[PDB]
Recover the amino acids of this structure.
């Protein structure tokens, strides 16, 4: 149950991540949201899992 | 003093303290209580009226 | 008459922390040169130990609406709730901003709050929101009001962190109530006001009050 | 309650991600709400503990 | 413009039964001082489009109009305004931008001048009445001056 | 007065949205017209 909850949360956040075309356009909101998501989930945690 | 219009601060005459609300402690927010214990404080807050 | 904060006014961002059943008031402070990070200077024992109030003073340089700020970034006014404010450190002339780094070990989602040299970007902009429901967006911020400051760049509250033994300030997702206590609004030309640095000349006799030079026997 | 949190997260996932492309309007709102209520992230991603 | 007229009418109604140095008058003066720049822009708009009808009627303009149809050239309208030395450079630029010049830079000035003359006149009169009321009921105020 | 203040704030936000754009499109015009009719009615009510 715990593993499934955290997997679902990470899936939801990754799906909330902005689109590549928006990021290339450099939209401020998209960059801010991506920064927030990066802050929540470190890369090392994803690699470890 | 008027009903509804006037805003009044309650003060203990003998001690001079002000009727105010205590700081909501944790686990009470968690239970979900909407009741804040009232107390007499030297300074209180700004919205004690 | 209730007084309204206005741009170009000096202010101190103050917060309250209860320690040992004793309320203690702290002011946001930073040095700028040598150390960009912000700390908290107590101002409750002033009647025994004067506080280092020089580095606690911020000027409200600008106050735009969120949309006006968006347009400006894409390219004496009263402070209204929901507007985004820009603060210059009075001494260093740097801007209070939300830093990307985070020295906190207890909190992992919190960032450091410090000073930055330039006013460019959205890190140096903070939105004021009412602490309680008596105030509402579009209202003028009245002196003595409790307000919460949200970083435009990270949607984090200017937060007082008591997690460790010492009291620290950071940008986190937990909110803290701040007071923008005014220091000065506008001085009549040529008149002395508190908090100025100046020289005390003996009458008009080109003699000033001073202490002995550096490395003196009298220990200055 | 991981097992209920998982269902709520699944609903939000379906609400924010459509046809293989993120819906920015819902994604930004969901991210903002989730950060404004950090307890949603679960005990692991809590602030201090 | 109609909504603006209704706002000004509401303000004038607020100034009913006014007294000298009245509280409502003083607060309205404070409001205008706070919104000074926007009021200045509004007044400039109104005075520009009021002077326009006059210049269009002015024979000097009608003379500068050589085209038989009546439509002067965008470069030629620039000349008519240049002659009266009334509108300032940027003002003439704004009038040209609002000119609605045809594909051949042709400006039916009769229509140009008459476009806003009615709503502009109405709101301008109401604003003048408001300012006169405030000036006569708050006699000593440099900010209003 | 409170409703009027809310409407004014909304209209200012919508203007700021359209400030940069050179021209206003048809749906924007319709929304301005709706908001402005409502504001006109509210001003008339206050005058009355």
């Amino acid at each position: 149950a715990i593993m499934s909850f955290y997997a679902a949360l990470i899936d939801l956040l990754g799906r909330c991540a902005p689109e590549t075309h928006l990021i290339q356009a450099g939209k401020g909101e998209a960059l801010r949201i991506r920064a927030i998501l990066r802050s929540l989930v470190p890369l090392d945690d994803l690699v470890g899992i | 003093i008027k009903y509804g219009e006037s805003l009044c601060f309650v003060q203990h005459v003998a001690s001079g303290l002000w009727l105010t609300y205590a700081a909501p402690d944790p686990k009470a927010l968690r239970l979900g209580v909407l009741k804040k214990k009232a107390m007499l404080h030297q300074e209180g807050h700004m919205d004690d009226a | 008459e209730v007084q309204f904060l206005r741009t170009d006014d000096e202010v101190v961002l103050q917060c309250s922390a209860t320690v040992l059943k004793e309320q203690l008031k702290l002011c946001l402070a930073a040095e700028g040169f040598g150390n960009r990070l912000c700390f908290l200077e107590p101002t409750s024992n002033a009647q025994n130990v004067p506080p280092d109030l020089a580095i606690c003073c911020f000027i409200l340089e600008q106050s735009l609406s969120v949309r006006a700020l968006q347009e400006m970034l894409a390219n004496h006014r009263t402070l209204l709730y929901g507007h985004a404010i820009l603060l210059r450190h009075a001494h260093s002339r740097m801007y209070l901003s939300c830093l990307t780094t985070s020295r906190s070990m207890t909190d992992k989602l919190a960032f450091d709050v410090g000073l930055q040299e330039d006013a460019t970007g959205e890190a140096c902009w903070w939105t004021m929101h009412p602490a309680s429901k008596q105030r509402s967006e579009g209202e003028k911020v009245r002196v003595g009001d409790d307000l919460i400051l949200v970083s435009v760049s990270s949607e984090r509250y200017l937060h007082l962190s008591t997690a460790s033994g010492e009291l620290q300030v950071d940008a986190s997702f937990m909110q803290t109530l701040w007071n923008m206590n005014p220091i000065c609004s506008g001085c009549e030309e040529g008149f002395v006001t508190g908090g100025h640095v100046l020289r005390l000349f003996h009458g008009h006799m080109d003699e000033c009050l001073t202490i002995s030079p550096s490395d003196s026997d009298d220990q200055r | 309650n991981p097992c209920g949190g998982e269902r709520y997260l699944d609903f939000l996932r379906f609400a924010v991600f459509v046809n293989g492309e993120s819906v920015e309007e819902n994604a930004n709102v969901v991210v903002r709400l989730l950060i404004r209520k950090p307890e949603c992230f679960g005990p692991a991603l809590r602030g201090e503990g | 413009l109609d909504l603006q007229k209704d706002m000004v009418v509401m303000l004038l109604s607020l100034l009913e039964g006014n007294v000298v140095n009245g509280m409502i008058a003083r607060q309205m003066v404070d409001m205008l001082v706070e919104s000074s720049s926007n009021v200045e822009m509004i007044l400039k708009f109104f005075d520009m489009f009021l002077k326009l009808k006059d210049i269009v009627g002015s024979e000097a303009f009608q003379d500068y109009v050589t085209d038989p149809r009546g439509l002067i050239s965008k470069k030629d309208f620039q000349k008519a305004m240049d002659s009266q030395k009334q509108f300032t450079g940027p003002e003439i630029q704004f009038l040209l931008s609002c000119s609605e010049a045809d594909e051949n830079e042709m400006i039916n000035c009769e229509e140009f001048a008459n476009r806003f003359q009615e709503p502009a006149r109405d709101i301008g009169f109401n604003v003048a009445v408001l300012l006169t009321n405030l000036s006569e009921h708050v006699p000593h105020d440099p900010r209003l001056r | 007065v409170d409703y009027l203040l809310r409407l004014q704030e909304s209209i200012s936000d919508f203007y700021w949205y359209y400030s940069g754009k050179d021209v206003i499109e048809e749906q924007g015009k319709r929304n301005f017209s709706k908001a402005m009719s409502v504001a006109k009615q509210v001003f008339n009510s206050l005058t009355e």
The helical segments of chain B are 28-31. Chain B has one helix and two strands. The longest strand of chain B covers residues 18-21.
